[PDB]
Design a protein around this ligand. Structure first.
Ligand SMILES: Cc1cc2nc3c(=O)[nH]c(=O)nc-3n(C[C@H](O)[C@H](O)[C@H](O)COP(=O)(O)OP(=O)(O)OC[C@H]3O[C@@H](n4cnc5c(N)ncnc54)[C@H](O)[C@@H]3O)c2cc1C
Ligand SMILES: CCCCCCCCCCCCO[C@@H]1O[C@H](CO)[C@@H](O[C@H]2O[C@H](CO)[C@@H](O)[C@H](O)[C@H]2O)[C@H](O)[C@H]1O
Ligand SMILES: CCCCCCCCCCCCO[C@@H]1O[C@H](CO)[C@@H](O[C@H]2O[C@H](CO)[C@@H](O)[C@H](O)[C@H]2O)[C@H](O)[C@H]1O
Ligand SMILES: CCCCCCCCCCCCO[C@@H]1O[C@H](CO)[C@@H](O[C@H]2O[C@H](CO)[C@@H](O)[C@H](O)[C@H]2O)[C@H](O)[C@H]1O
Ligand SMILES: Cc1cc2nc3c(=O)[nH]c(=O)nc-3n(C[C@H](O)[C@H](O)[C@H](O)CO)c2cc1C
Ligand code: FES
Ligand code: FES
Ligand SMILES: [Br-]
Ligand SMILES: [K+]
Ligand code: NA
Lengths: 197, 403, 406, 202, 384, 247
């Protein structure tokens, strides 16, 4: 299946967190609790699965050169439109925390608004315009990219929770060790480096 | 019926003969304060006071109404206190035959007795302390009640005495005690025993459950886990068969029954057998003229879980039915913890929580269902040297305090 | 130009559609009108804040003030309200301060709870009723080397409904005061002329407010007795400006005016039959005196009572006549004092040393039930810390030791 | 001046705050790329904080991000155009890292945390300061990664490579992301051991 | 410190009987478990090198080669012979000249970092470094430069373990992380056809590379010109890393620690299941173009480091899952990943090292799943 | 205040778009020259014509180079804006491109444009050599190259990879001048005109006509280069066109 292959590639081979190194800021910050990480990954998946396909239509129906008119190429509106679309969906996500305020509005805090700037969300949309992903491919890529990010964040939270039984030097505790963990985690994701879609 | 395969029977030399004989005369007896969980004593005696059989020695400030009474009549010869004036033991020199008596009933009325009436007699005599609540292994509050009272009619501790041998001698008292527990319990009485036969109660409330397998099979925590899972909102009570005989004796004769049959066993015991003694009997006097020469350790209780019988603690523990004598000679998961733990728990994870002090996490993994004896094997097999019994209590104490 | 206009219009149209969707989300996912907040059971006490997340903000706006030293952030933890209904769940930051049992009761941090629907909260009644009294000074005498008794006359023939061991609040205005202006008697000024403590001057840019415990039991109607210690620069930090309110209080004299507010406090005497043991130090003599006088003269309590005050020399001791009279008049009460460094002119024949060790050897060491005694303490931080360790080593539970840290 | 240099060592956007990590790990292969990215991040962050401040009092919270991102993307879009028309070679090296400046959390992060709730001039000073700390990290990591991974600093042969006739064999991991992960992690270790005030509690 | 006057029961309910096993005994058991693979590793290392040298040089030309390589003439000085008639003693001696310098460098350099963390942080030295040092020395090519061995152990000991608090407090395998460091930092010395044999000027592809090129038919020992039978790979009479070659030697050591309870048989079982399932699945699907689809399970077993990793490194208690159910899941992912990387990853001939590292990251999630489902059974009172 | 939010967002959205739109439309032309000179610098470099600076490159490109369009399906010149045709964009659109089968797509190029641009080098008024853009995926990324073939249509004059993404050192040596110089004098086709350019593991036989040494320790990237030429040096690539050049 072409779709199954794209989906596996966007999770494991092209893991936005551990393969492309996108979205590291929230990934290294909110990684402490698996539950919070799972909620964020779930929230990130929803945002990605909606953002890429929405931008696909806007680019191919409006912003693609010679789409609206012959000789008019409003491609230059690509960066602003995509981020704006991602940003719009974030406000709804913030509003939605009326049901999930305890687990995520508070755990994320300042970072809930910043989910709009995760490189994974912007980067994923950018790859959909360089490549030639159909709308069906756009959904599989967006969902696939999100799932790969959630696996890493949920995995990094699992490792961090396991490490409560550790004697980490102070000064390295928290951000310093987390950077080393992601660097070590990326080593094991290099198992997919050669894989061919 | 319920068979246990995950566990370990320690092959320690010197198993008892399983024949009841008369132990050395005991002229000293004590109650160990630290044995009762979360007990802040209100002393009712001073050194030199004369006490009767079932006279109150001290009371619990944090468990109002619970009376800890003497096992014997005599004189209070010392009140040992430790760091921060923690009451270690109240030693009473046996000397006399005075006793406090109580009401007696016919055997056919015990099942019908009023619950409050049963509680009053048990509390005044001091036998209420035989019950311990899981969660937390504390003496039950006077005003509290439990839907499940577990009778431990089996002993899979190494070198333990056979309950059938003891209960057969007191068939009438044991059955009478079960009848009393039938009226005391809000729900059912679980008589957890081995396959052999024991005297039975005709009450519909009393159910017999057979457990077979290695050591952990005979612990009340294991039985509770399989028959009545315990939590903060589901509290069970535990009582051993020898205390049940005492309960039956109290409501049949109106007197506190303090006699006990304990296994004196171990590699350095010349004639390992069952001996008749009294509650809190001095272990220094009990094993006198019965041990091989050399530097030995007397343990109140089993080698797996038990107290070093030295100094202020050299007396038979309240919940101990055996005396074991021996010669003085991190959590890297090796399949060690899982092999000796038959409960539905993740041992290499719960124990990590106890080591880390993660009180909230340990509760989720089932710490509240546990007593120290339930983790003795995990301590035994730990390549790292940890004492999970201590870690468990520290977590449990934290839960009680913060809650 | 041409494509530019085309881009500008498609962009504006697209963003606006997004805004329209966002507004649609606002209408359906966040409907809101106005929230009613119930204070206790009184309709008069009630806040109609439109929903906005905080409670401490809505409450401050309405007129009720709860301590909020940090000002939100979940740092001080002094903002605590019982939100029995409403408020959702306890956030982990709040749990850092609120215990599980307390949170289960309904304890919450106001600065952390979001007002999102009508909620009922239970606030202490004492907060609503705070009364201002522009008093006239009666006495400002030096009780000791660095302690002044300030006696204030309550106006109009009124009196303060305060509790024993309670405290009030003094609101001094902006002022520049020179220590040379102070009225330190010759008996005590030996140390003051020695270190040249008179050199100090206090300057305050804005009006300030502080708290001071009472040293008059409630029946002393008319007057708010208080004991104040001058806050001279610290011994390990000499290079600092001096005290601001204490310097102002010392600057006051007879006939001066001083505005207060109050009462407040939770360092009250427990209503039981247990023996009471009081351990005072320095200005700590104010709450101890009010407690002892309240329990001998107003409650006429027969419970066993002892007082153990720590001083450096006989001159430092004060209120000796009052405790001596009470000790003589009442057989249940005995007081003592220990001098850490008795003077040659003292000819002291009593306890010498620190009161932690005086008390242990004299009374608590051989006491059969040190655990069954209520302990009330107020004194220097070093003295409180030493006594608590000594009591704990005697098996005294935290529930039996009530402190008055200033 | 003190406010500008505070986010260098006191509240570094990558060490104390958790912003801009994505760009640090991607462009630190050469000091040249890192430096151009830092100036670009400095230019956008300072202006973006400035514009949001002018309209902070007049911004609706529901469409707050939309308003802000429109400002941030617009500045980066213009900067990309300037780079393409002038400095075309430099634009080419940066690839998508120009567009990715938009997702750099420092730009929107300081825009929300600081520019709103704050004055435009001081907001501008805050944006410049974070770019310095962002560049303090970018340049420190770029130094080790280029020196060991390429044997070169700013394209200048510092360490002769065996392939040129020299003795140094480049470390291939220094060219990959994990090296950046480790270097930043060790950099935070040094800062928080030289500044215990920033240490995190157990 | 100090001494005090009276005891409490907590301290009296000590352990009064405990098991003989301790951390010290666990590590020495594992250290001895790899001795059979190690001793053979040297004999094979010398035999392959000596055979290759005779296929490449002869007469005075061989003498010049022997004189220009300290490994060769040091063997001659001590009584060995580089001629093809050399016996087992000379082959083992030559292999030792390669292994021991690597092992000494790794032991000392890694030991320095271990003591340094312990000295500064006032910790007692831990015996776990015995396993990391020996294993790291056994998973590298015989020709590995010492300065690269020093860098590799430093990454493994420091970056992977010490900064996490040392032995028992990390999550990633330390020894494989050092190999991974060298693998990506200096790939040329730990990859290709020039590193697995100590015969200077010799180029020879190992079995996995040869199979990936031309399948089972390409399996040839160039030095001997002879086919590489399955028996050769099992015993380790094949080119490779010192210690991994003999699947037989590794099984012998693995049996003892497994019987002793030091190594998890659920993890080892999981690895075998994961490999067999995926390897057989590829066999069935088939591929007219990828020769690796058709490698059978028994060939996957005796090639590369599958045996060494499965027995002595995938079984690492600290980095593996702590739940019996998780242990099964943990092992299967290793087995699947190794085959996946072996078959469908063009760049890498082996995937064990990378596979365990991937599995290390996810062992904690598997445990979490097992435990969270357990909590739900408990919150349901076990349906009682 | 719905009115306030709409006013600010609409007002900012149009105006910001205006600054962005003015910047993009205005600077596009400058960008256009910059993009063109980049390709001209490469075509001159491979042709062996040294040029330096925009003034020299443009003057010399016009003097010596004549871009032309070619239809792959027929190998015949077509008329069009050779100077502007964007084969990359064409290959992405079904109108001016085709989709390749697994058998046809040897170089891993997903699609192949119906028309691809070529460049003719003219020493005088006659074409002394032809430059063909060829691309195919290596191990890590798509690699684009220019190949300058002499009038024979078989002998290759120059090679240059102007866009590639591979590990420097192991696989990134397609930029290495020594490796590229090895192609000069090589034959693109064999005796029977079948793609024959071969990348040799271990080193080509001395005097090899179609033997170029592969990248040491970099077989996978060297395989991609071979796959690049096998598609473009064939029927579906430039095969038919070179047959016409050939004779
Ligand atoms: C319930 C309660 C009861 C109390 N009862 C009493 C009582 O009976 N008597 C009493 O005296 N107090 C009492 N206090 C304490 C009282 O509220 C004040 O804390 C005290 O009087 C000091 O007032 P101040 O404003 O002058 O001190 P501050 O002005 O806050 O100064 C405190 C100290 O800090 C030093 N300082 C100033 N600047 C610096 C600097 N930059 N760095 C370092 N140190 C500096 C000053 O020199 C001084 O030594 C009570 C408090 C409470 C809560
Ligand atoms: C956490 C991220 C990673 C941080 C660790 C990265 C450190 C990177 C560089 C390490 C230092 C490299 O320094 C390295 O020193 C060795 C010492 O022999 C040199 O090696 C030199 O000597 C040896 C022995 O005589 C020769 O075999 C070798 O051919 C020669 O080059 C290397 O050529 C040089 O490159
Ligand atoms: C305790 C450890 C386990 C004990 C052993 C367990 C038994 C496991 C058997 C797994 C199933 C049988 O394994 C079987 O192996 C043989 C060789 O033996 C393969 O035989 C061959 O067939 C395939 C085609 O089908 C060929 O492409 C290939 O040459 C080879 O794989 C079978 O394809 C595989 O299906
Ligand atoms: C690459 C191959 C191997 C890796 C792929 C497999 C990964 C499998 C793990 C998926 C992620 C873990 O998912 C974990 O599931 C458990 C239940 O089992 C959830 O358990 C929890 O979920 C709920 C939320 O729904 C919480 O309120 C609550 O504390 C608990 O029920 C964790 O919160 C979730 O994070
Ligand atoms: C059965 C067993 C296997 C081990 N395997 C490894 C290993 O592969 N690599 C390693 O560095 N240490 C190994 N160790 C040592 C130690 O447990 C390991 O380094 C931990 O990861 C250190 O926390 C092993 C120890 C045992 C008991
Ligand atoms: S105001 Fe400080 S904790 Fe709420
Ligand atoms: S810079 Fe913050 S997610 Fe990339
Ligand atoms: Br094309
Ligand atoms: K392959
Ligand atoms: Na092998």
């Amino acid at each position: 299946e072409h779709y199954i292959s794209l989906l596996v590639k966007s999770i494991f081979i092209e893991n936005m967190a551990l393969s492309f190194f996108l979205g590291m800021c929230t990934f290294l910050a909110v990684s402490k609790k698996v539950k919070t990480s799972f909620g964020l990954g779930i929230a990130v998946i929803v945002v990605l699965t909606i953002s890429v396909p929405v931008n696909n239509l806007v680019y191919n129906l409006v912003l693609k050169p010679d789409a609206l008119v012959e000789g008019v190429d409003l491609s230059f509106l690509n960066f602003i439109t995509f981020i704006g679309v991602i940003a719009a969906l974030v406000q709804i996500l913030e509003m939605i925390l009326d049901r999930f305020f305890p687990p995520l509005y508070n755990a994320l805090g300042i970072f809930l608004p910043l989910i709009t700037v995760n490189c994974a969300i912007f980067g994923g949309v950018s790859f959909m315009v360089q490549r030639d992903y159909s709308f069906a491919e756009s959904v599989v890529y967006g969902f696939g990219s999100g799932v790969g990010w959630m696996l890493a964040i949920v995995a990094l939270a699992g490792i961090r929770e396991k490490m409560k039984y550790s004697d980490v030097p102070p000064g390295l505790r928290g951000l310093g060790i987390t950077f080393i963990t992601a660097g070590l985690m990326a080593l094991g994701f290099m198992s997919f480096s050669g894989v061919q879609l | 019926m319920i068979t246990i395969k995950k566990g370990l029977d320690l092959p320690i030399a010197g198993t008892p003969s399983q024949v009841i004989s008369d132990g050395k005369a005991i002229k000293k007896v004590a109650l160990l304060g630290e044995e009762y969980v979360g007990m802040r004593p209100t002393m009712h005696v001073r050194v030199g006071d004369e006490v009767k059989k079932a006279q109150i020695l001290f009371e619990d400030k944090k468990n109002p109404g619970v009376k800890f009474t003497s096992p014997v009549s005599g004189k209070v010869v010392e009140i040992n206190r430790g760091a921060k004036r923690v009451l270690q033991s109240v030693v009473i020199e046996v000397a006399g035959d005075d006793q406090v008596t109580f009401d007696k009933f016919e055997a056919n009325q015990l099942a019908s007795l009023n619950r409050d009436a049963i509680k009053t007699q048990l509390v005044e005599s001091g036998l209420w302390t035989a019950f311990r609540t899981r969660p937390f292994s504390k003496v039950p509050a006077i005003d509290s009640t439990s839907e499940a009272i577990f009778v431990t009619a089996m002993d899979t501790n190494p070198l333990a005495a056979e309950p059938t041998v003891v209960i057969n001698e007191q068939s009438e008292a044991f059955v009478a005690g079960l009848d009393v527990l039938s009226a005391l319990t809000t729900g059912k009485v679980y008589v957890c025993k081995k396959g052999t036969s024991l005297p039975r109660s005709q009450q519909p409330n009393v159910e017999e459950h057979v457990f077979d397998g290695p050591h952990p099979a005979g612990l009340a925590g294991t039985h509770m886990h399989f028959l009545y899972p315990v939590s903060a909102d589901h509290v069970a009570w535990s009582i051993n068969y020898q205390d049940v005989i005492a309960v039956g004796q109290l409501f049949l004769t109106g007197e506190l029954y303090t006699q006990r049959v304990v296994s004196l066993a171990g590699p350095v015991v010349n004639k390992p057998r069952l001996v008749r003694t009294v509650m809190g009997a001095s272990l220094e006097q009990l094993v006198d003229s019965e041990i091989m020469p050399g530097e030995v350790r007397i343990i109140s209780g089993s080698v797996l879980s038990g107290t070093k019988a030295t100094g202020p603690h050299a007396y038979l523990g309240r919940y101990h039915l055996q005396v074991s004598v021996l010669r003085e000679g991190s959590m890297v998961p090796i399949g060690n913890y899982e092999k000796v733990m038959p409960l539905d728990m993740e041992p290499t994870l719960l124990l990590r929580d106890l080591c880390a002090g993660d009180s909230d996490s340990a509760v989720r993994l089932g710490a509240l269902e546990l007593d120290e004896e339930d983790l003795a094997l995990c301590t035994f097999v730990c390549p790292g040297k940890y004492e999970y019994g201590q870690l468990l209590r520290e977590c449990l104490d934290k839960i009680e305090k913060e809650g | 130009m041409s494509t530019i206009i085309f881009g500008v219009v498609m962009f504006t149209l697209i963003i606006l559609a997004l805004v329209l969707v966002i507004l649609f989300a606002k209408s359906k996912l966040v409907p809101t009108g106005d929230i009613t907040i119930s204070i206790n059971g009184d309709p008069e006490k009630a806040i109609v804040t439109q929903p906005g997340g905080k409670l401490l903000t809505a409450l401050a706006g309405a007129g009720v003030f709860v301590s909020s030293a940090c000002g939100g952030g979940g740092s001080c933890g002094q903002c605590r309200v019982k939100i029995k209904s409403g408020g959702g769940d306890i956030l982990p930051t709040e749990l850092d301060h609120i215990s599980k049992g307390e949170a289960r009761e309904g304890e919450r941090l106001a600065c952390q709870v979001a007002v999102k629907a009508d909620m009922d909260l239970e606030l202490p009644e004492e907060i609503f009723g705070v009364k201002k009294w522009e008093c006239t000074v009666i006495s400002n005498d030096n009780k000791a080397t660095f302690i002044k008794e300030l006696k204030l006359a309550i106006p109009d023939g009124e009196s303060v409904p305060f509790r024993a061991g309670g405290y009030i609040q003094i609101e001094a205005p902006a002022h520049h005061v020179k220590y040379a202006d102070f009225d330190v008697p010759e008996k005590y000024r030996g140390d003051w002329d020695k270190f040249n403590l008179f050199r100090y001057e206090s300057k305050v840019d804005e009006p300030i407010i502080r708290a001071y415990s009472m040293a008059n039991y409630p029946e002393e109607f008319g007057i708010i007795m208080l004991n104040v210690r001058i806050a001279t620069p610290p011994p390990n930090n000499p290079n600092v400006p001096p005290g601001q309110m204490s310097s102002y209080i010392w600057s006051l004299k007879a006939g001066d005016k001083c505005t207060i507010s109050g009462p407040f406090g939770e360092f009250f005497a427990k209503d039981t039959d247990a023996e009471m043991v009081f351990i005072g130090g320095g200005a700590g003599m104010a709450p101890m005196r009010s407690h002892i006088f309240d329990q001998l003269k107003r409650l006429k309590s027969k419970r066993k009572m002892s007082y153990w005050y720590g001083a450096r020399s006989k001159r430092e001791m004060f209120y000796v006549e009052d405790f001596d009279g009470l000790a003589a008049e009442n057989d249940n009460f005995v007081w003592h004092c220990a001098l850490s460094d008795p003077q040659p002119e003292d000819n002291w024949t009593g306890y010498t040393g620190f009161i932690h060790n005086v008390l242990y050897e004299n009374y608590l060491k051989d006491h059969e039930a040190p655990e069954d005694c209520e302990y009330y303490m107020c004194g220097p931080p070093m003295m409180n810390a030493a006594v608590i360790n000594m009591l704990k080593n005697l098996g005294v539970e935290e529930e039996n030791i009530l402190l008055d840290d200033f | 001046k003190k406010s500008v240099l505070a986010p260098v060592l006191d509240n570094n956007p990558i060490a104390l705050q958790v912003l801009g990590v994505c760009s640090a790990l991607a462009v630190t292969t050469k000091l040249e790329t890192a430096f151009v990215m830092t100036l670009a991040v400095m230019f956008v962050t300072a202006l973006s904080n400035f514009f949001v401040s002018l309209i902070r009092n007049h911004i609706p919270n529901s469409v707050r991000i939309i308003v802000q991102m429109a400002i941030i993307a617009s500045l980066v879009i213009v900067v990309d155009q300037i780079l393409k028309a002038y400095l075309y070679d430099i634009s080419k090296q940066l690839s998508v890292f120009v567009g990715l400046i938009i997702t750099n959390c420092i730009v929107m992060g300081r825009a929300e945390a600081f520019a709103m709730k704050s004055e435009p001039i001081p907001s501008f000073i805050d944006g410049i300061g974070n770019g310095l700390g962002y560049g303090f990290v970018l340049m420190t990591v770029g130094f080790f990664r280029e020196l060991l991974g390429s044997g070169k600093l700013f394209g200048l042969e510092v360490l002769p490579l065996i392939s040129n006739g020299g003795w140094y064999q480049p470390n291939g991991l220094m060219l990959l992301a994990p090296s950046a992960f480790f270097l930043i992690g060790f950099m935070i270790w040094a800062i928080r051991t030289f500044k215990p005030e920033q240490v995190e509690a157990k | 410190a100090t001494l005090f006057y009276t005891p409490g029961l907590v301290t009296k309910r000590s352990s009064h009987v405990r098991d003989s096993v301790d951390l010290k005994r666990i590590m020495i058991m594992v250290w001895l478990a790899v001795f059979p693979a190690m001793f053979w590793g040297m004999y094979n290392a010398g035999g392959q090198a000596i055979a290759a040298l005779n296929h490449l040089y002869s007469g005075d030309q061989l003498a010049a080669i022997v004189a220009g390589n300290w490994h060769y003439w040091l063997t001659e000085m001590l009584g060995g012979t580089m001629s093809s008639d050399a016996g087992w003693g000379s082959k083992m001696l030559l292999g030792a000249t390669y292994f021991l310098p690597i092992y000494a460098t790794v032991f000392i350099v890694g030991g320095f970092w271990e003591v340094l963390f312990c000295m500064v942080r006032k910790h007692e030295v831990n015996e776990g470094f015995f396993v990391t040092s020996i294993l790291f020395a056994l998973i590298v090519p015989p020709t590995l430069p010492l300065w690269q061995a020093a860098l590799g152990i430093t990454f493994g000991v420091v970056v992977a373990k010490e900064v996490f608090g040392g032995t028992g407090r990390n999550f990633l395998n330390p020894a494989l992380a050092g190999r991974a460091f060298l693998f990506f930092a200096y790939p040329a010395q730990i990859s290709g056809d020039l590193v697995w044999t100590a015969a200077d000027g010799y180029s020879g592809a190992t079995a996995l590379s040869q199979w990936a090129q031309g399948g089972a038919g390409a399996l040839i020992n160039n030095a001997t010109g002879q086919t590489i039978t399955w028996m050769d790979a099992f015993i380790g009479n094949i080119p490779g890393s010192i210690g991994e070659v003999s699947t037989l030697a590794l099984m012998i050591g693995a049996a003892f620690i497994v019987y002793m309870g030091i190594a998890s048989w659920r993890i080892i079982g999981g690895v075998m299941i994961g490999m067999i399932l995926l390897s057989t699945l590829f066999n069935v699907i088939g591929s007219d173009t990828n020769a690796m689809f058709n490698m059978p399970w028994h060939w996957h077993l005796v090639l590369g480091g599958f045996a060494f990793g499965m027995f002595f490194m995938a079984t690492d208690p600290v980095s593996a899952s702590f739940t019996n159910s998780g242990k099964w899941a943990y092992g299967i992912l290793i087995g699947v990943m190794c085959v996946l990387i072996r078959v469908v990853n063009p760049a890498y001939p082996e995937g064990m090292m990378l596979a365990i590292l991937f599995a290390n990251l996810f062992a904690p999630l598997f445990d979490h799943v097992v435990v969270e489902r357990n909590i739900k059974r408990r919150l349901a009172r076990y349906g009682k | 205040s719905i009115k306030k939010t709409l006013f600010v967002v609409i007002a900012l959205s149009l105006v910001c778009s205006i600054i962005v739109s003015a910047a993009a439309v205005g600077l596009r032309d400058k960008q256009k020259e910059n993009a063109a000179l980049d390709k001209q610098s490469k075509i001159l470099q491979v042709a062996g014509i040294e040029a330096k600076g925009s003034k020299q490159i443009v003057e010399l490109f016009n003097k010596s180079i004549e871009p032309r369009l070619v239809d792959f399906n027929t190998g015949d010149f077509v008329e069009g804006d050779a100077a502007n045709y964007d084969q990359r964009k064409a290959a992405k659109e079904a109108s001016e491109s085709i989709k390749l089968t697994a058998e046809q797509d040897k170089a891993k190029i997903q699609r192949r444009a119906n028309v691809g641009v070529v460049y003719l080098v003219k020493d005088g008024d006659k074409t002394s050599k032809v430059i063909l853009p060829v691309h195919g995926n290596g191990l890590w990324s798509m690699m684009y190259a220019f190949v300058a073939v002499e009038t024979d249509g078989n002998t290759v004059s120059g090679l240059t990879y102007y866009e590639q993404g591979e590990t420097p050192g192991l696989g990134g040596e397609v930029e290495n001048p020594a490796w590229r110089a090895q192609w000069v004098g090589k034959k693109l086709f064999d005796e029977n005109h079948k793609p024959a350019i071969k990348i040799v593991k271990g080193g080509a036989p001395q005097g090899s006509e179609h033997g170029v040494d592969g990248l040491s320790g970099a077989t996978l990237t060297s395989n991609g280069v071979q796959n690049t030429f096998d598609f473009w040096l064939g029927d579906m690539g430039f095969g038919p066109f070179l047959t016409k050049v050939r004779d």
